[PDB]
Design a protein around this ligand. Structure first.
Ligand code: ZN
Ligand code: ZN
Ligand code: ZN
Lengths: 161, 93, 111, 227, 196, 64, 175, 208, 56
């Protein structure tokens, strides 16, 4: 073979920065969170239980609800007149909005008795910019310019108010 | 007296460095303990410097006596003065 | 070293017979009693050197972070060896070196 | 190779490439991939037919319950001893909270040797009435762990004359620790176990033999199916 | 696992172990017996791994002497159960069950959570006591608190996960309270009103 | 040396609370529980590691 | 963060024996095996095990951010898949004695040319280098067991303006 | 002198039925306990090619299918082989290989797995008799045997490494969805309906 | 390597600022500078408190 010069080391470092970037840890952690952590936290305590040994003919009734799947969407903006539309970070910056997306949870109800259920909105989670769940992840260089976003911006932050 | 025996091996080098005599240590033990303990000591020429003792269930009592002896037997010196150094002082006279 | 009971696995405390004048190891959880071989009931070391060379393993020659010398082995006269200082880490510990051969793997000094 | 035909062909290929243990030349042809060392001897790997009906458990002593450690017990039972190899275990449970195991053995060496020789030579239909008396030795506390899969553990026994190796299933593992009997319960302890147990050797009944053959029919139906 | 007693002071150098939901420290021999290994020899087998080291055996001797008073598993569990900070007046069997619960769970939870799996807990206890003795006998330096390979960094993921766990538990408690209030009226709630 | 301590235990005969006093003597290895209202006395052996909770639990076991 | 179940499966496959089958008197020379701080078993040939684990991690079978630490002095073998460990990449020097390339970098000019092109000669980026075994990640805890050359010129053995490099003469040879 | 606790002398006249054994160990009643690895399975049932072909299961998950394929091709099996003389003989696909160093290896087909033997004391094999509630010992388990793959280049090790590497790569629990309206619309409309029926119920109760 | 007591292994910088430091010397020098900054920013409060008590 041939020896490895310092320029080869800088080529390897350039490959590293081409693949990872400078804010990869933030985006990777947030993507891991949104992808698995919310579902695992919901499934940590998946069963609420209420019992009532009614005697008023003894009927032991158990009421229990199960938590199912987590559904996420792209961030949306709801106006005073009632309409909705897709939100982008520049609009959130200009109008002092929060860049966040709704979270839906499947709740299943069962009515246990012994003688002896769809998507519910549970809240809005702020979205980290340029992550897998951000609207700017897909946009190419030209639409990024049309959206008034700087191509040198790297993301890794949230827009609250 | 009791069948239990208590002998302790003392380092020859540091005992000679401190300039101490075995008889002095024997008299110190005799004074602090009166006749409650019979004491014998090997002479100077012995290969290993030893000093035995005999009391006059007492294994734990002998252990406590040995711990007390190791702790608070003062051979010589001023209590509280842990170490002493020699210093040279330049004085104008 | 202290022995254990052969029937209920507890510690064998020493005991002295008044009538027989003998040292016996007896378990306090039963009536078992075995005759003691030596009169060394207890030994306390004020200044000790154990653990200085006791920290030795048989795979220490595979460590790449250890320095390598060319000192002569006393047993097989090899030309490669690995040295290190004392494993004891008190303030009074000496700075002497322990050498380990790469064939017989014994610990030897330079004095 | 997701094709079922491909999997079947691979199975028959593996079946056909078995090296005959008597074929010394083919055995020497085989070479270790890493060690690069030639083969010396070979043995066939086969299951056992006569033992699948029975239930086998791996029994181990934990800690001080070791027979070698208990020197007076080992001296009394003999310094492999046939008494150890012919010992009896009797699990008795007064309640779910309190449980122990009773151990029995043959103190006499001649009786234990005769019983072991008779037991290890059962290949005919004539069994002598060996009224062997077993004496209680010691009791231990027990815990049990079950295997989720059937053949989680298997013990291998060898047979040099046939060049085979017979393996038996293991259902569970039993661990024993030394138990110190409470002095306030010795009155109830004396009413549980027995000082002696007599074992009588008799030919198995026809109905029990048929039941065991029916149990073995799951493994081997060619030679044991009822007609 | 504290090591009480100063050098040449305080008589014996006993080793007491702090346990969760237990008001006062506990000697290592008693909890070792409570886990289910009574003989002292096997306790030393678990703790030490080389019989010729007489110094660690000497340092464990006061613990053996102190724990000699307890000699059975059940009395050891009961002794655990008296100090377990629970309501006063609990019966002996219920105290033993409470000790079994507080011993199976919340004692080294990262090892295991199921029953009859306490052998690994005993081995880990022996390992901890061995490390404590190795540091106490000046055989090893105390651990470097500022070592960076012993530190961890929490990014957006773990922080948001902890926050979401707290908020989701609050939301679940609100759902529970609303359900309890609504069952009084006995109505087929839409379940889209309980969630806030 | 006898040690007298005021305890917040409940007597099972008079039902009055905060009227239980534990008296333990380590020299003779004994422990006495006395009710300030019922005047009943309970005796149980104690060990070197004994605490008032030990004697209280012993009294509970004796009562049932 | 990575799951520890494949790690336990690999360890049990390669001869690790559980704690219930462990006797400290019998095993006076075995190595304790920890996984995420949990003592899970023992082993008597730690060298083959650590070699196999490291080769598997370098091939991509185990995640590259998994820590493989062998403490020879304390007879311990620790593995970490926890979240929050800070790591950095390093070149790998061929340390196999039986190989001809001993004492030399695994990365060659072919790798550099492939990186410059962007594809393999039957995308080739940083991850391709990491899973080819020429680069690997190490955290602060694993750094205590490795020996690092500062520059590739250091792998092979009087101007008043040029800086002076350490001699490192205390050892006769360096691996 | 620990006196014997049991001295009643009561004796049970229990007789156990015993069956002849197909084989008898020679020279030593020793057996080796072997832990079953994940890549190896035991099929005591005789090999039946047609049901085996008809019961092959295909799954969308490539890792599970690959694991099933590996364990199936590596499963220890046996079948009846028709001899050329007209008799029937038991034929197996598994063998035991002993090298010159004295070590043993389990061979199935072309795959070879090494054996690591650890000596174990006070370990025996017993037979359970549930109908009588007693345990009858069988032999001694002197050595514990672990099965280890021979080399990296073995196909079993490569398939296991591939399956375990690609098993942890697939991780996606949350499922995306498209919101068309305000997520709080359901809450406010149901609150309005509940307030309306509260007013109606209050009016009815005042009118009742 | 382990157990190295040579000057370069324990923080002796043999180069000048004009010549340029090696990475090991750079890191050791940064450690010493960090010590200086911490010492100043920590002793300032104690000195201020002593001065206030003296004045009062
Ligand atoms: Zn005893
Ligand atoms: Zn040598
Ligand atoms: Zn009262």
């Amino acid at each position: 073979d041939d020896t490895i010069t310092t320029e080869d080391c800088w080529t390897v470092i350039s490959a590293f920065f081409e693949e990872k970037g400078l804010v990869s840890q933030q985006l990777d952690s947030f993507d891991e969170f949104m992808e698995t952590s919310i579902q695992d936290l919901v499934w940590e305590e998946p069963r609420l239980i209420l019992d009532q040994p009614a005697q008023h003919d003894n009927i032991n009734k158990r009421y229990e609800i199960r938590f199912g799947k987590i559904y996420l969407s792209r961030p949306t903006m709801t106006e005073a007149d009632g309409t909705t539309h897709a939100m982008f970070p520049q609009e959130a910056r200009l109008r002092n909005l929060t860049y966040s997306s709704p979270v839906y949870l499947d709740m299943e109800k069962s009515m246990f008795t012994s003688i002896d259920g769809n998507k519910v909105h549970i809240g809005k989670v702020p979205i980290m910019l340029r992550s897998k769940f951000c609207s700017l992840r897909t946009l190419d260089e030209v639409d990024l310019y049309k959206m008034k976003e700087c191509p040198y911006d790297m993301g890794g932050y949230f827009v609250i108010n | 007296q009791s069948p239990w025996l208590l002998r302790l091996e003392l380092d020859r080098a540091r005992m000679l460095d401190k300039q101490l005599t075995m008889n002095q240590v024997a008299d110190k033990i005799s004074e602090v303990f009166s006749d409650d303990l019979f004491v014998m000591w090997s002479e100077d020429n012995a290969d290993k410097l030893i000093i035995r003792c005999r009391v006059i269930e007492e294994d734990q009592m002998l252990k406590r006596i040995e711990a007390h002896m190791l702790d608070l037997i003062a051979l010589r010196g001023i209590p509280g003065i842990s170490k002493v150094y020699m210093v040279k002082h330049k004085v104008s006279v | 070293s202290f022995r254990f009971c052969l029937e209920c696995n507890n510690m064998l405390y020493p005991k002295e017979d008044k009538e027989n004048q003998r040292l016996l190891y007896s378990c306090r959880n039963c009536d078992y009693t075995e005759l003691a071989e030596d009169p060394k009931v207890y030994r306390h070391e004020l200044i000790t050197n154990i653990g200085e060379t006791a920290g030795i393993v048989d795979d220490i020659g595979q460590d790449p972070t250890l320095p390598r010398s060319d000192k002569e082995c006393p047993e097989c006269h090899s030309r490669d060896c690995v040295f290190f200082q004392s494993q004891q880490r008190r303030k009074d510990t000496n700075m002497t070196l322990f050498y380990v051969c790469l064939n017989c793997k014994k610990t030897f000094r330079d004095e | 190779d997701t094709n079922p035909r491909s999997q079947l062909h691979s199975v028959e290929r593996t079946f056909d490439e078995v090296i005959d243990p008597r074929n010394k030349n083919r055995l020497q042809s085989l070479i270790h991939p890493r060690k690069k060392i030639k083969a010396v001897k070979a043995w066939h790997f086969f299951p056992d037919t006569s033992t699948f009906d029975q239930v086998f458990h791996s029994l181990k002593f934990v800690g001080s319950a070791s027979l070698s450690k208990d020197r007076p017990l080992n001296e009394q039972l003999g310094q492999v001893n046939a008494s150890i190899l012919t010992s009896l275990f009797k699990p008795i449970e007064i309640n779910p909270h309190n449980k122990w195991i009773s151990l029995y053995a043959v103190t006499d060496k001649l009786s234990a040797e005769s019983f072991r020789k008779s037991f290890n030579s059962i290949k005919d239909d004539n069994i002598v009435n060996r009224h062997v008396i077993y004496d209680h030795i010691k009791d231990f506390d027990q815990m049990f762990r079950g295997h989720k899969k059937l053949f989680e553990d298997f013990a291998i026994s060898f047979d040099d004359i046939s060049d085979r190796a017979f393996f038996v299933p293991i259902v569970g593992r039993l661990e024993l620790k030394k138990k110190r009997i409470v002095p306030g319960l010795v009155d109830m302890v004396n009413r549980t176990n027995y000082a002696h147990i007599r074992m009588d050797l008799r030919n198995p009944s026809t109905q029990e033999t048929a039941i065991r053959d029916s149990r073995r029919e799951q493994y081997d139906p060619v030679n044991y199916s009822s007609i | 696992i504290k090591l009480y007693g100063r050098e040449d002071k305080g008589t014996g150098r006993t080793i007491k172990a702090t346990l969760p939901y237990v008001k006062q420290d506990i000697p290592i021999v008693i909890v070792f017996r409570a886990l289910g290994v009574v003989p002292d020899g096997e306790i030393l087998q678990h703790i030490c791994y080389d019989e010729n080291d007489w110094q660690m055996l000497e340092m464990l001797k006061p613990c053996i002497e102190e724990g000699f008073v307890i000699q059975d598993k059940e009395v050891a569990l009961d002794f655990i159960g008296r100090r377990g900070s629970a309501a006063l007046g609990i019966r002996r069997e219920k105290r033993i069950q409470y000790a079994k619960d507080i011993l199976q769970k919340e004692l080294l939870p990262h090892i295991t959570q199921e029953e009859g799996f306490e052998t690994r807990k005993t081995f880990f206890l022996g390992y901890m006591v061995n490390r404590l003795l190795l540091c106490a006998l000046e055989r090893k330096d105390q651990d470097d608190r500022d070592h960076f390979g012993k530190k961890r960094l929490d990014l957006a993921g773990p922080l948001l996960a902890n926050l979401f766990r707290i908020l989701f538990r609050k939301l679940t408690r609100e759902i529970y309270r609303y359900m309890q209030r609504c069952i009084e009226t006995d109505r087929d709630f839409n379940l889209n009103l309980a969630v806030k | 040396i006898k040690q007298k301590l005021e305890t917040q235990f409940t007597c099972l005969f008079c039902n009055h609370d905060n009227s239980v006093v534990c008296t333990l003597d380590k020299k003779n290895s004994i422990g006495l529980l006395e009710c300030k209202k019922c005047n009943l006395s309970f005796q149980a052996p104690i060990n070197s590691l004994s605490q008032p909770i030990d004697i209280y639990s012993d009294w509970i076991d004796a009562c049932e | 963060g990575s799951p520890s179940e494949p790690i336990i499966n690999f360890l049990e496959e390669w001869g690790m024996e559980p704690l219930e089958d462990y006797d400290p008197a019998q095993h006076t020379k075995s190595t304790r095996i920890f996984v995420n701080g949990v003592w899970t078993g023992i082993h008597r040939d730690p060298s083959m095990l650590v070699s196999t684990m490291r080769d598997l991690r370098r091939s991509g079978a185990i995640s590259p951010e998994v820590s493989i630490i062998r403490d020879i002095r304390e007879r311990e073998f620790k593995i970490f898949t926890d979240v929050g460990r800070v790591y950095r990449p390093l070149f790998i020097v061929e340390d196999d004695e039986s190989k001809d390339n001993k004492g030399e970098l695994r990365i060659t000019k072919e790798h550099i040319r492939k990186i410059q092109q962007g594809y393999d000669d039957d995308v080739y980026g940083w991850s391709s280098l990491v899973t080819s075994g020429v680069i690997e990640y190490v955290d602060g805890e694993e750094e205590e067991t490795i020996m690092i050359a500062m520059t590739p010129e250091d792998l092979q053995t009087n101007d008043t303006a040029k800086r002076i490099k350490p001699e490192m003469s205390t050892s006769s040879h360096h691996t | 002198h620990t006196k014997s606790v049991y001295d009643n002398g009561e004796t049970l006249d229990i007789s156990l039925p015993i069956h002849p054994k197909s084989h008898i160990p020679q020279g030593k009643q020793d057996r080796w306990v072997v832990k079953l690895p994940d890549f190896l399975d035991i099929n005591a049932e005789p090999f039946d090619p047609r049901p085996f072909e008809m019961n092959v299961k295909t799954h969308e998950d490539k890792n599970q299918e690959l694991l099933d394929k590996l364990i199936a091709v590596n499963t220890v099996r046996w079948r009846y082989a028709k001899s050329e003389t007209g008799g029937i003989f038991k034929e197996t696909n598994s063998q035991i290989i002993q090298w010159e160093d004295g070590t043993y290896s389990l061979r199935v087909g072309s795959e070879i797995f090494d054996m690591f033997t650890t000596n174990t004391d006070d370990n025996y094999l017993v037979s359970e008799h549930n109908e009588e509630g007693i345990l009858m010992t069988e032999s001694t388990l002197s050595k514990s045997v672990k099965l280890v793959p021979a080399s990296f280049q073995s196909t079993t090790h490569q398939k296991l490494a591939k399956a375990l590497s690609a098993k942890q790569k697939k991780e996606s629990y949350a499922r995306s969805v498209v919101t068309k309206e305000d997520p709080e619309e359901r809450q406010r409309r149901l609150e309005s309906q509940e307030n309306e029926r509260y007013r109606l119920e209050r009016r009815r109760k005042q009118a009742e | 390597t382990k157990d190295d007591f040579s000057p370069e292994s324990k923080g002796f910088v043999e180069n000048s600022y004009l010549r340029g430091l090696t990475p090991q010397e750079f890191f050791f020098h940064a450690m010493a500078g960090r010590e200086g900054l911490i010492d100043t920013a920590v002793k300032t409060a104690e000195t201020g408190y002593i001065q206030r008590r003296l004045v009062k």
